[PDB]
Amino acid sequence: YAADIDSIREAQARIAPYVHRTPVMSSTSIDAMVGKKLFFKCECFQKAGAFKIRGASNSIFALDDEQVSKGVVTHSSGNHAAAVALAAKLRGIPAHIVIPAPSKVENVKCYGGHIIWSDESREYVSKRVQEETGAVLIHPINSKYTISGQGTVSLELLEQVPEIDTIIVPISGGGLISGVALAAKAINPSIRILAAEPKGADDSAQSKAAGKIITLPSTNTIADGLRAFLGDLTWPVVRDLVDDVIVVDDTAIVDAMKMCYEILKVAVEPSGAIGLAAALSDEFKQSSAWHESSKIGIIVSGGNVDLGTLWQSMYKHL
């Protein structure tokens, strides 16, 4: 596979000065609903509001002196942008960030990212910047270094809760779940890894059922971080090391988000709540994975969400 336990441990050593060891939270009330013990790995509390700084940090700090000196570049409309900007700030090198985009821009400026605006056009702008500067491209999902950084989530989780027997992971490009599964399977081959995916962007579930990478002409989900398709380095992990993809609709995602805010008191983004929706779902509850499970890790992947509606009403109230 594109990463392994060795590369993941190298990642952990490399990024440990720069990322938070994020907390695990639980709730007896949610536990009762599911009928199992849930452990929420809170990457919403990671630097920049999501897990992606791990992969971005590993990618950037892994570059030698010669390479990194040209800066880094990426095009992104989401959490990857801020992650690259922060990782580059920590390394001391420029980050050229081609946007787009929603708030997610403010997070890049916060880290001194050099924003180069896009309108196709994303790739052309990213392409021109690369040709002229030589800046190294940092991938949101599909590389050894970001997969490896992402797997550190599993190293921490299994230190924090060593009896975890199943892990539910949100899926988009599959970087997070690939790193998580690779690290976890290496520490304990009997751990079950399950993906959580929205109905209107259910390519990963289709892919697994079809035995081949499926792409979709469009996607239809409020889980804005979950609209990508699998890459050629992540699909093999999804195919071989992930038992199943639990598919849930957006209403279930919102229902789960509501629970995160109201019960856990964690201000997650919709994409970060989907693991809980999966754990609450009939599809999961009526399955063998459920019957065999006892202690389930849930990766709460981020918390970057625009709640401007809320604030407007409050300021209107006066």
Ligand X SMILES: *Cc1c(COP(=O)(O)O)cnc(C)c1O
Q: Please, what's the b/e burial string for 58-78 (b: 16 or more CB within 10 A of its CB; e: otherwise)?
A: bbbbbbeeeebebbbbbbbbb
253: phi > 0 → left, psi -120 to 50 → alpha, else beta; which? Answer: alpha
57 binds Mg ion (CB under 5 A): no
Are the beta carbons of 174 and 141 closer than 8 angstroms? yes
Identify the active-site residue in 36, 41, 47, 52. Answer: 52
What count of Cα atoms within 13 Å lies in the side-chain half-sphere of residue 194? Answer: 29
Cα–Cα distance for residue pair 20/47, rounded to 1 Å: 7
| Residue 164 interface partner, choices ligand X, Mg ion, a copy of itself, none, CB cut-off 5-8 Å depending on type | none
5, 33, 45, 114: which one binds a copy of itself (CB under 8 A) = 45
CB of 64 to ligand X, least distance (A): 25
- The count of other CB atoms within 10 Å of the CB of residue 318 is 4
- Subset of 189-248 contacting Mg ion (CB under 5 A): 197, 201, 203-204
Q: Which helix (H) or strand (E) holds 300?
A: strand 295-300
DSSP-assigned letter for residue 65:
H
Which listed residue (7, 59, 76, 77) is catalytic?
77
Q: First vs last Cα of the chain: how many Å apart? A: 56
Quick check: 25 binds a copy of itself (CB under 8 A)? yes
Catalytic residue flag (residue 52): yes
| Residue nearer to a copy of itself on the CB measure, 1 or 45 | 45
Query: What track of x and - describes contact with a copy of itself for positions 207 through 236 (by CB under 8 A)?
Result: -------------xxx--------------
User: Residue 243 and residue 204: Cα distance in Å, rounded?
Assistant: 12
Residues carrying an active site annotation: 52, 77
Binding residues for pyridoxal 5'-phosphate: 52, 79, 172-176, 301
- Residues of this chain that interact with ligand X (CB under 6 A) are 50, 52, 78-79, 141, 170-177, 225, 228, 269, 271-272, 301-302
Binding residues: 52, 79, 172-176, 197, 201, 203, 301
